[PDB]
Amino acid sequence: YEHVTVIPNTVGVPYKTLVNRPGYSPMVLEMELLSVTLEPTLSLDYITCEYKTVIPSPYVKCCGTAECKDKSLPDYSCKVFTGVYPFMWGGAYCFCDTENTQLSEAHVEKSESCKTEFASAYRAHTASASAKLRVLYQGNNVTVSAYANGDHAVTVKDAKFIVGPMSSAWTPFDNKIVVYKGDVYNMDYPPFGAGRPGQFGDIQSRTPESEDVYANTQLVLQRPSAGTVHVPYSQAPSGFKYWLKERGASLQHTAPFGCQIATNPVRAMNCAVGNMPISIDIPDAAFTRVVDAPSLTDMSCEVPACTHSSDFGGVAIIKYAASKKGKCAVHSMTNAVTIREAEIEVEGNSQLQISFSTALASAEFRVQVCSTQVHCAAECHPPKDHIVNYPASHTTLGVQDISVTAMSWVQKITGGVGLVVAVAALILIVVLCVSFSRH
C-alpha cells in the first residue's frame, strides 16, 4: 500500500500521518525530522591568502651604473637609484663617493602560510538534499538517514520511505561563496585577475598548490635613506588580513530561517523552509484486518482542561467499550489540533487519556480511535507564560478559527444590521410597488 503525505520542513517537531486502508485497522505514523542538510555543488574559482614581499639583497654597483631586466614574477618591479653612498658597520661600502648605483628589486608571492590560512572563492550551484528522519512505526523508534532528492528509498521494518524532493529551492548560499574555516560568507568576490590592492582578492591563485599567482599590490620601490643599504617600498597591506578583521558576521549567524552553517563540506542545515513530501510503501503483511483488531463502541469525549499553549497543555478523556484487548491507533481529524499519542492500549469498558495542543480559543475537534470517531469540545484558556524554548506543536489559525462566543456575537450583530436592511429594503420595495401600481 502506497501512502503519500506532506510534512512541514521543520526540525524537532513530530508530525502524524494516518494510513487508511479500508478493511484493515488504521495505522498512525509519527515522523520527526532530526536533521535536514542542503549541500551545494561548489566550483572553486580561486583562493586568497596573505602574500609575502620578496626582496633579494640589493645590488650595489660601485663606480658604475647598474641596469635591471624585466621578469615575469607576479608583481615585479626594479629600479636603479643613483648617487648612493651606503655605509657598513666598518665604514663606507666602496671606493667611489657619488659614482654609485643601487639596484633594488622585489616581487610578490604566496606566503608559506597559504597552505593553512586561506579563503576559498567558490561558485555555488544547486544543492543535494539529505535528511535524518525519526519514524515511529508500529510502536518502534527507527531512525533513517536518507537522501531527500526523491530518489532514495530507505527501509524501516520492511516499509520503504522515499523523501523529497523538497518543495522549496531556496538556499542561504548565493552564487558567490567565500569560505575561510568554519565560516561561510556571501561575498561578491572579484573575478580572477581582477583583484584590487588592500582588498580581498589582491593576491589570487587558482589552487593551493598552483605556482600561478595573480597579484595587484601596488608595490613601489622607494629611494633608500642616505648611508644605508635597506630597500624601502610602498605597498598595499594584504587584503586578506584586512578582510579577516572586517569579515563581519558569517552566514551561521545571519542566515534566514534559522539555518545552521557548517564547512567541510559546506552545508546548510535545519532551514525552516517550505515543506517536504514523503512517500511510504507498506507491505500487506503489516496490516491487521479490522475483524482481528480491537474495535471501540459507545465512545464519548470529555475535555476536563484545555490551554492553548505551545506544548501539549490540553487533555481529553474518552470513554470506550473495547471488543478485545489490544493496541489502537489515535488520529486527529482536524489540522487545528495535534494529538501527542499515536497509539493507546485499550481493553474492556474504561476510559483513555490523550494529550493535545491547539491554538484554538474554542477547541472543537473529532478524534478517530480504531476507526471510531468522537466529537470533543472545550473552552480553552491562554497560558500565563509569555516565552518558551520550543516551537509550537500546533498549526496556526485561520480567520475563521474563532471562539464560539465570538461567533455568536458576530451573528447577533450581523443579523441585527441585516434585519434593519432587510426591513428597509422591504419598505422601499412595497412603496415602489405601490408607486408602480398607481398611474
Binding site: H253, G258, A272, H308, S309, S310, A359, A361, S362, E379, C380, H381, P382, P383, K384, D385, H386, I387, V388, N389, Y390, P391, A392, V399, I402, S403, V404, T405, A406, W409, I413, T414, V417, G418, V420, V421, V423, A424, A425, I427, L428, V430, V431, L432, V434, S435, R438
Partner: protein, 102 residues
C-alpha cells in the same frame, strides 16, 4: 540589560561562545474568549494586534455603512409615498401615513 522583541517565528540569541538560545512567544492574553464583547476584542487584539484592528475597523465601517443604506432607503421610500399627497390641491393625509412617514 537588553530587551529583545520576539517574532512569531521565533528569535535566536547568541551570547559570546555559548550555544544559541531560542525563544518563541506564547498566545498569552489578559483578555479572554468566552467573555464579554470587550474582553473578546482584547483577547484577539493582544494576539493579533494588526489583523484584529483591520477586521474590526472594516467590519465596523461596513456595518455602519449598511445602516446608512437602510436609512437612505427609508428616506427614499418616505419621499415617494408622500409626494403624491402633497401635490393634491385638497390634500388630506391618512392618519397611518401621517404617523408612519410624515
Amino acid at each position: 540589560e537588553i530587551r529583545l522583541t520576539v517574532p512569531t517565528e521565533g528569535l535566536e540569541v547568541t551570547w559570546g561562545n555559548n550555544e544559541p538560545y531560542k525563544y518563541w512567544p506564547q498566545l498569552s492574553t489578559n483578555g479572554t474568549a468566552h467573555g464579554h464583547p470587550h474582553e473578546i476584542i482584547l483577547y484577539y487584539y493582544e494576539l493579533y494586534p494588526t489583523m484584529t484592528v483591520v477586521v474590526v475597523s472594516v467590519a465596523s465601517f461596513v456595518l455602519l455603512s449598511m445602516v446608512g443604506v437602510a436609512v437612505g432607503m427609508c428616506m427614499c421610500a418616505r419621499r415617494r409615498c408622500i409626494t403624491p399627497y402633497e401635490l393634491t390641491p385638497g390634500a388630506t393625509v391618512p392618519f397611518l401615513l401621517s404617523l408612519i412617514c410624515c
